[PDB]
Each structure stands twice: as C-alpha cells, then as structure tokens.
Amino acid sequence: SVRIVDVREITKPISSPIRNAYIDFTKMTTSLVAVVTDVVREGKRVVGYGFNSNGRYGQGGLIRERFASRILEADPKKLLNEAGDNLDPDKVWAAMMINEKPGGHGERSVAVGTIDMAVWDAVAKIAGKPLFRLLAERHGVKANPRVFVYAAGGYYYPGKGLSMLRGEMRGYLDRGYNVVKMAIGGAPIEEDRMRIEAVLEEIGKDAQLAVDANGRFNLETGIAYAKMLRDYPLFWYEEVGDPLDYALQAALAEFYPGPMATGENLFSHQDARNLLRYGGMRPDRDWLQFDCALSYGLCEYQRTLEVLKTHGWSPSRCIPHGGHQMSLNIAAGLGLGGNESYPDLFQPYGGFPDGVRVENGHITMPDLPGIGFEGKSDLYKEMKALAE
Amino acid sequence: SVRIVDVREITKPISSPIRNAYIDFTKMTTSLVAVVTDVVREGKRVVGYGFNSNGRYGQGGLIRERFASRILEADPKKLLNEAGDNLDPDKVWAAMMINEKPGGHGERSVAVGTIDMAVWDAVAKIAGKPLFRLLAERHGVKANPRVFVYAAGGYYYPGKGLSMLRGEMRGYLDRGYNVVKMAIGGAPIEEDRMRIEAVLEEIGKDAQLAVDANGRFNLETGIAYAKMLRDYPLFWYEEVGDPLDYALQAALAEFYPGPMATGENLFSHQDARNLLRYGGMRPDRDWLQFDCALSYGLCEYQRTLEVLKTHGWSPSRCIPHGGHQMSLNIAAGLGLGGNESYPDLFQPYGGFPDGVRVENGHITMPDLPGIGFEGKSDLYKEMKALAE
Ligand SMILES: [Mg+2]
Ligand SMILES: [Mg+2]
C-alpha cells in the first residue's frame, strides 16, 4: 500500500529591503510544502518536502484550493508506478493538472512545481535513493555528484555602499565561490559602472563577475549597457529585457558577443521552446536559467530538456535559478551546467546539507535519500514542524 | 476627497458538467469583486464591481493576499487624476502591480484584471458616464453603442445528443443571434463532423457556425481537422493548437484559408505581441480574442491595442472572449469587432442589462453609468449583496 495521506502547506517569509532593477523583496514569501505518505523507510514515515524559489511569492491559496485537493481525491491506485510499489511522479502531476486550461503559465506553475518537488522527494525516499541517483537511473545515464555553484547577491540596499558591496563579495569568495553575480539597472548606468569596477577590483583574479538586469531594460537601454559592459571580462549578462521580448534578446547578439543568460521567468516548456525559437541565443556560450520549482516541477522540466534537444542545445547550458537543492539533484543527475546559490539570502531555504563545503566553485552531493533536506538541520527543523 | 475604502471579494460557483476538448467545468469558479469608495452621492455610495471570465477559476487568495492590500495601503492622494476629482485607473493599476516580477502572466493576471474592471466601473460612475462613452472620450473617438455579439455553447455534455445540440442552437437563434459557436476536438473527428453537420442543418441560412478546438490539437491533428473543416462555410476555426505554439498556428495558414481565431489564453500585451510577431495570422480575416478580465484589465488591454497598431492590425479584429459587460463597453467605446456571449452559461455573470434584446446579432448599449451592471437585476442582486 502506497498513498498520499495529506498535503500540508505553510507560507514562510523571506522578505527584506534588498532591491533589483525591477522589484524589492519587502513582502517576499514562499510556500513550504509537505507530501505525507503512509509508507515507512529508515524506520520513519516518509514525507516529501518542497518550497518555491524567491521572487514569485508563496502560493498557499492555489495549493489548497486547487491542486492538493485533486491529489487527495484521486484514486490512490491510479498514482502508482508499473510495479505498484511507489508513486509515479507523472501520474501525480497529471492528476493535479486536470481541468487546467492551456496558457497562463504563472502562479499555478509555482504551486505545482512546489508540490512536484515534494512528490519527487517522497518517491526517491520510498525507493531509498538520493534523488540525483534515481534520476540518473531513470534516464540511463551516469550521475556526477560534483556540481558547479555560483554565489548570487549584490543587490541594492538602503545605505549599502561600495565598501559594503566589496565586503559581500569577499564574503562569498571566503566561502569557496569563484563566480559571483550582482544586480544592475537599479541605478544610473555610470553608477552601476562604479559598482561593477569596485566588485571587479575586489575579486581580482580569484573570481569572475556576472551581472543581472532583471529584465528591466528596453532595447536601447539594453544596448547602452551592453556597450559599457562588453569592455569588462564578465561571466555573463543576465535577463537584459522583458523575459518574453524574444526579439529584443535576438537583437543584442549584434552588440554583445560575450555570454548572456535568461529564462528564470519562463515557466513552461512552451515558453522555453519560444525562447529557443525566437530568442537568438548562442547555444555554445549562453545560459538557460529555467527554474523547475517555479515551472510545474521536474515533470515539466524533463519536457523542457526534451525541447532543448529538439533545438540542438545541450543540458550543460542549463544553470537553474532559485538556489535550491531540487536543482542540485537535477544538475547532478542529468548533467546540467550547475546551480545558482544565495549564501546570504532566503535562509534556511536553499543551501546545502550541513557539512558540504563549496570548494573552487563546486560542492559534492552526499548520498542522502531523496532531495537531502534532512541533511540541513535549520531547514529540516522547519519541515518536520510542518509534517513529520 | 476620493478614496478606495475597501476591496471585498467572494468566490462564486459557475460549475457544471459541460466539457470541451481540453477541460470540463466541474469545479469552475469566479471571483466577484467590489471596490468601495468613500464617495457618496444622494446617500448612495459609488461601488465598482467586477468578476473574471469562465475558465481560469476564481482568485480570492491573490486578490486578498497581494493586490487589494497594496491598493488599500497606498496613499489615497497618489491614486487620483490630474484634477484630483476622480481615481486614475492607471495609477491604481501601477499601485497594485508593485513588486511583481516580469513574465508569468497567468492567475495574477486574472486577479488584477478583475479588480481593474471594478476600478473602471467606479471611475465611470464617479464621472457620471457610461464606461463606453468615457472611453471614447479619453481616446478622442466617437462611441458606437451597437455591438455585435455571437452565442457560444455547443459543449459536450453527458447524455447530450445531436437533437439536443440542434435544440441548443435553435434556442440561440430564437433569441436573435446569427452566429453560433460550438466546441470540437472532444470526440473522434468523424463524430465531430456529424455534430457540425447537424448544427449546420439546423441553423440553415439564418446563422453561421464557428468551431472551437480549445488548443487541444497538435500540428498533424490541427491539419487533419482543417482539411475536414474547410469544406464547410464556417465563420471561424478557433484556438487550433496550444495558445503559445505560434509556429503551429503559422503553419495552418497553408491548409486553412478560412478565418481563424485565438488569443483567449494569452494574458499580457507581451504575449499578444508574440502572437502577432510569430503566429502568422491574417490581419484581414482572423480574430484576436484577448480577454481584459483575465489579462490585467483594461489598463493592460489598452497597451495591447497599442501593440496591434504597431503591427498594422485593426482593433476591429478583436472580439474578446468571456461574454462580459466590461468587453461590451470596450467594444462600443473603442471600436472592437464585437463580443462573445453565453446565453445559457455562467449566469447571472455576463449577459446584458434587463430589456436589451439581441437583434440580428447585435445589441445596443443603453446609457447606464459605469459598466451597466445595475441594469441586470439578477447580477446586481449578487453585487450589492457583496458591498453596497
Ligand atoms: Mg536573475
Ligand atoms: Mg474558446
């Protein structure tokens, strides 16, 4: 007997006055979800957990009012795999997606992606395997526990000056990171130049710098920043214009030969397909940042990887946004290019298991069952408080 | 003094076992919203009302947790027009859109669009004008109260046969409609052919038939249906494939010269822009069905009309999905091609003021202040029950 006995949710705050070119995180929240089963492993009830990434807010209402109910109301026998000894993630996905009209991929994509995370967590636990190894198995590939991670921060903050910006970055380098990201477009172009040079000077030859415009720029502004930016050895220029203005992105290739990245705000394989079709991105050097937690989960992310193949892209071009363990498992299991990380933000959500250190921009996935949340005490404390 | 004193919401059920190619309306709901102002004329305070269209579900949670609060917390003086004698819809729009990241246009687009509807309703009432006339004024154009409307139905229903389908359609013709729409793709292609011929025979020369696939078809199926459909004198072929698969839509032009329609499931001007850029639709005969109530409202719809102009399209190509009075006002005020109508569904939401009859596919907008909800007793009853 294998069945989902309950789906609990609790909205947690991850707010602060940090600000980027488009938004400030003054009221930012996230949904912590628990998928409770009636299965037991390692002498404890198996409970899958999940939470959504920063930026799109918690989805308690949708989870309760539309998706959780469908799962709990579904015939338990129709959510199992071939052998009937575990849950089939895709069947659970399909079950919660009934009566949902096409298009409109936002908000509900976060609710579903967060539940999906907890479902895969439970499935892996029931199978007694680390999620990344279960994924490698299902895809017939060899997993690689060594995953590249970069530190994201450099936000605009009330009273935060250049010296403080430099300190923040040095703080990331002190922790083993060799690639850092900062926000831009939240100040006059010449002020951002100063912020960039300050950071560039601080990290010297020990790390590379990536900048994020958060989709705030129109074509002309995007080009203006491109001309200023291309004179520096940046790791990448992220989300220059509106995430859906593919023509704008395509036009940037003419002014910015260096690597660019985007995708965190595209939440479906259909939207990702359109990015690959009309975005004009360079598959040899650009980065795709789709976030499964905000995009209907891993079940959907697999369809997105299928889209990349149809368009001749390599999964190694993917570096998910979000800084969460779900992405780490996908990266390690399916060969993504790496994962984002927020060493000083949104804690305890995200991060790594207690003990794993970042060495030369890389961490090594320990063999913990499921996603590995249990290994991060301050996070797991929050989770077992929700359901155990 | 002009200020929004409260924003109330109540989720109403508009469910039934009707089914289309993609979804069934078993759990369908809608949010009824009231924007209460401190403006009282003759011991009667002005209250704006709004509700979202069928298909995307109610958004009580989002409205309460994210948007209403921003409006109520905003400085009342910063939401007024130049003269400070009325609310500025765009300022209210901007106020509720703060701290919202780009992309992900779904769900929140419905919440905002529903509040927006109530805001414009209140603004027009405060100005003492029918919304459509206020719109014509703001755009410097002449309003036209005669609006084209078509009856939408023909859903798959348990135990509903051809005879019953025929009766449904005759029922619409009896009420003055000369264009009817039915769902397709919810049965084998040859069964749908039978349903189509049945309806075609029933309406004879008194009306034209439109078919809706609800975005269920893949390219090959879309083409197969196109070959079958093009042999009949259909009014239009709606949403053939996924609303975001623009390439699929473009490819259909080769097999279906007759008019096609889509757009109900695109909820932003950015998404509409992409449809015009990559959809390959014929601006001389196709129809755009964007629904302001599901797309961030009229404030956003105006930006969408701007997008149509930038791409050489005429607003007369627009026939909003949803069957609601907000669209009727926009159609009459800005010259859209007409509006959808559900004579037998989702009542009392949608419809026309008590007394206005559909004659030869057209209704004539009476000069009621605001949207004109007060003129439809069964609907207004529900509204004043929410707030008065
Ligand atoms: Mg970013
Ligand atoms: Mg339709």
Side-chain angles (χ1 to χ4, degrees):
Chain A
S1 167
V2 182
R3 73 163 309 182
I4 296 174
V5 170
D6 194 13
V7 179
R8 304 181 75 91
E9 179 281 341
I10 182 174
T11 307
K12 299 289 195 177
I14 48 170
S15 50
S16 72
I18 60 170
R19 173 180 65 85
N20 61 40
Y22 218 109
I23 249 68
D24 81 44
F25 291 57
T26 264
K27 301 286 202 295
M28 199 50 61
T29 58
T30 180
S31 287
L32 185 59
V33 171
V35 167
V36 190
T37 81
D38 63 352
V39 179
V40 30
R41 295 281 183 277
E42 304 181 84
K44 65 171 182 171
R45 165 198 284 176
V46 37
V47 179
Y49 300 106
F51 55 85
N52 65 271
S53 315
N54 63 278
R56 313 305 303 206
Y57 297 98
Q59 304 299 324
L62 275 173
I63 292 168
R64 286 179 254 109
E65 287 161 37
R66 234 197 280 161
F67 304 108
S69 45
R70 287 165 186 160
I71 292 174
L72 299 171
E73 290 168 357
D75 186 327
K77 300 180 183 177
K78 299 195 181 71
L79 302 182
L80 310 178
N81 56 20
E82 299 274 290
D85 57 31
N86 202 340
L87 294 171
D88 184 315
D90 294 300
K91 292 190 181 185
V92 174
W93 196 88
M96 71 178 137
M97 280 305 285
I98 62 169
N99 299 323
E100 288 298 315
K101 286 182 63 175
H105 304 306
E107 243 54 56
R108 69 172 183 186
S109 56
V110 177
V112 170
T114 190
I115 293 172
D116 170 279
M117 182 179 302
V119 173
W120 281 94
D121 186 38
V123 169
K125 286 173 179 178
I126 290 176
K129 306 197 181 77
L131 180 55
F132 75 92
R133 289 191 184 290
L134 180 61
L135 277 177
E137 269 175 42
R138 293 166 66 88
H139 282 64
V141 298
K142 294 299 170 294
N144 180 339
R146 183 179 147 81
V147 180
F148 164 74
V149 291
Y150 71 92
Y155 285 87
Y156 298 98
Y157 193 88
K160 177 182 179 181
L162 292 179
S163 49
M164 284 173 259
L165 210 200
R166 263 159 152 284
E168 183 192 349
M169 297 307 177
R170 174 50 59 182
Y172 300 139
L173 268 57
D174 293 327
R175 277 172 282 187
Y177 291 100
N178 62 190
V179 174
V180 295
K181 188 168 75 182
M182 64 184 285
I184 59 166
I189 188 171
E190 284 301 335
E191 195 182 315
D192 279 331
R193 180 198 292 284
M194 296 306 102
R195 293 173 60 252
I196 295 174
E197 302 194 315
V199 177
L200 241 33
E201 181 165 63
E202 175 60 51
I203 65 178
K205 297 182 176 181
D206 306 312
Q208 287 176 281
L209 176 64
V211 299
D212 195 334
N214 281 283
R216 186 67 283 180
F217 305 156
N218 56 15
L219 181 57
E220 290 195 292
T221 299
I223 293 178
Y225 264 80
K227 292 177 174 177
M228 180 269 272
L229 266 32
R230 66 187 181 189
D231 292 324
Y232 300 97
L234 280 14
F235 197 61
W236 77 48
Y237 181 14
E238 182 176 324
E239 192 170 53
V240 182
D242 187 285
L244 291 170
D245 192 342
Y246 306 126
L248 183 159
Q249 179 60 214
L252 261 44
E254 184 190 328
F255 305 88
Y256 200 79
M260 290 192 271
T262 190
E264 77 189 57
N265 292 309
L266 293 187
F267 311 114
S268 69
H269 71 96
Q270 291 93 326
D271 287 297
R273 184 168 56 207
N274 289 337
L275 172 66
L276 297 190
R277 278 174 173 168
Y278 320 111
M281 297 187 90
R282 298 70 59 90
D284 70 338
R285 54 174 169 292
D286 291 339
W287 307 100
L288 304 177
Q289 308 166 304
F290 311 120
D291 188 334
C292 76
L294 309 175
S295 309
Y296 299 104
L298 178 55
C299 288
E300 178 73 0
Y301 197 85
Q302 298 191 309
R303 283 181 279 280
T304 300
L305 288 178
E306 209 50 59
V307 164
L308 296 212
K309 290 171 66 304
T310 295
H311 292 260
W313 281 70
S314 169
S316 74
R317 286 285 104 203
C318 299
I319 295 180
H321 153 287
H324 56 75
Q325 297 91 313
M326 176 54 141
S327 293
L328 287 180
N329 279 274
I330 302 177
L334 309 181
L336 304 186
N339 193 201
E340 182 176 16
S341 168
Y342 306 106
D344 303 332
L345 275 12
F346 324 124
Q347 293 307 319
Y349 311 98
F352 317 111
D354 297 336
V356 351
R357 321 271 83 169
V358 175
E359 311 183 307
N360 296 304
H362 297 70
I363 61 85
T364 297
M365 300 290 278
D367 290 312
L368 295 167
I371 293 175
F373 289 138
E374 284 70 21
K376 190 168 191 287
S377 67
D378 66 343
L379 212 204
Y380 184 52
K381 176 189 179 183
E382 230 55 55
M383 295 171 170
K384 55 184 172 188
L386 173 59
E388 188 173 54
Chain B
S1 167
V2 182
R3 72 163 310 182
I4 297 174
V5 171
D6 195 11
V7 179
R8 304 180 75 90
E9 178 283 340
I10 182 173
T11 306
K12 299 288 194 177
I14 49 171
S15 49
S16 71
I18 60 171
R19 173 180 64 86
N20 61 42
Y22 219 108
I23 250 69
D24 81 44
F25 291 58
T26 265
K27 300 287 201 295
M28 200 50 62
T29 58
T30 179
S31 289
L32 185 60
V33 171
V35 167
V36 189
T37 80
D38 64 350
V39 178
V40 56
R41 303 194 193 307
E42 313 153 61
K44 162 73 178 293
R45 53 149 46 74
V46 36
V47 179
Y49 300 106
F51 56 84
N52 64 271
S53 315
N54 63 279
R56 312 305 303 205
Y57 298 98
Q59 305 298 322
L62 274 173
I63 293 168
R64 285 178 256 108
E65 288 161 37
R66 235 196 281 160
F67 304 109
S69 45
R70 286 166 186 159
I71 293 175
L72 299 172
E73 290 168 358
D75 186 326
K77 299 179 183 177
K78 298 195 182 71
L79 302 181
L80 309 178
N81 55 21
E82 299 274 291
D85 56 32
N86 203 339
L87 294 170
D88 184 314
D90 294 298
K91 291 189 182 185
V92 173
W93 196 89
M96 72 178 137
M97 280 306 285
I98 61 169
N99 298 323
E100 288 299 315
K101 287 182 62 175
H105 303 306
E107 243 54 57
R108 69 171 183 185
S109 57
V110 176
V112 170
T114 189
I115 293 173
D116 170 278
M117 183 180 299
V119 173
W120 282 94
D121 185 40
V123 169
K125 285 174 181 177
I126 290 177
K129 307 197 181 78
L131 180 55
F132 76 92
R133 289 191 184 291
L134 180 60
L135 277 177
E137 270 175 41
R138 293 166 65 89
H139 282 64
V141 298
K142 294 299 169 294
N144 180 338
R146 184 179 147 80
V147 180
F148 164 74
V149 291
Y150 71 92
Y155 284 88
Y156 297 97
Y157 193 89
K160 176 181 180 181
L162 292 179
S163 50
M164 284 173 258
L165 210 200
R166 263 160 152 284
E168 183 194 348
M169 297 307 175
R170 174 49 59 182
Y172 300 139
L173 268 57
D174 293 327
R175 277 172 283 187
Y177 291 100
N178 62 191
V179 175
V180 295
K181 189 169 75 180
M182 63 184 285
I184 59 166
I189 188 171
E190 284 301 335
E191 195 182 314
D192 279 332
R193 180 198 292 285
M194 296 306 101
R195 293 173 60 252
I196 295 175
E197 302 194 315
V199 176
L200 241 32
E201 181 165 63
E202 175 60 51
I203 65 177
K205 297 182 176 182
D206 306 312
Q208 286 176 283
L209 177 64
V211 299
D212 195 334
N214 281 284
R216 186 67 283 180
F217 306 157
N218 56 13
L219 181 58
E220 290 194 293
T221 298
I223 293 179
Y225 264 80
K227 292 178 176 177
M228 179 269 273
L229 266 33
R230 66 188 181 189
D231 291 325
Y232 301 97
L234 279 14
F235 196 62
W236 78 47
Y237 181 14
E238 184 175 323
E239 193 170 52
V240 181
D242 187 284
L244 290 170
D245 191 343
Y246 306 127
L248 183 159
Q249 179 60 212
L252 261 44
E254 183 191 329
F255 305 87
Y256 200 79
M260 289 190 270
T262 191
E264 77 187 58
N265 292 310
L266 292 187
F267 311 113
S268 69
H269 71 95
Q270 290 93 325
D271 286 298
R273 184 167 58 207
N274 289 335
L275 171 66
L276 297 190
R277 279 174 173 168
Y278 320 111
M281 297 188 91
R282 298 69 59 90
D284 71 337
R285 53 174 171 293
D286 291 339
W287 308 99
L288 305 178
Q289 308 167 304
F290 311 120
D291 189 333
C292 76
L294 309 175
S295 309
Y296 299 103
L298 178 54
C299 289
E300 177 73 1
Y301 196 85
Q302 298 191 309
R303 283 181 280 280
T304 299
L305 288 178
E306 209 51 58
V307 164
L308 294 214
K309 290 171 66 304
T310 294
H311 291 260
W313 280 70
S314 169
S316 72
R317 285 286 102 202
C318 298
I319 295 180
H321 153 288
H324 57 75
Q325 297 90 313
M326 175 55 141
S327 291
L328 287 180
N329 278 275
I330 302 177
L334 309 180
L336 303 186
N339 194 201
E340 183 175 16
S341 170
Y342 306 105
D344 303 332
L345 275 12
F346 324 124
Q347 293 307 320
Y349 311 99
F352 318 110
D354 296 335
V356 351
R357 321 271 83 168
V358 176
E359 311 183 308
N360 297 303
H362 297 71
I363 61 84
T364 298
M365 299 291 277
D367 290 312
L368 295 167
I371 293 176
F373 290 138
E374 284 70 21
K376 190 167 190 288
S377 68
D378 66 344
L379 212 204
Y380 184 52
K381 176 189 178 183
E382 230 54 54
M383 295 173 169
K384 55 184 172 188
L386 173 60
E388 187 174 55

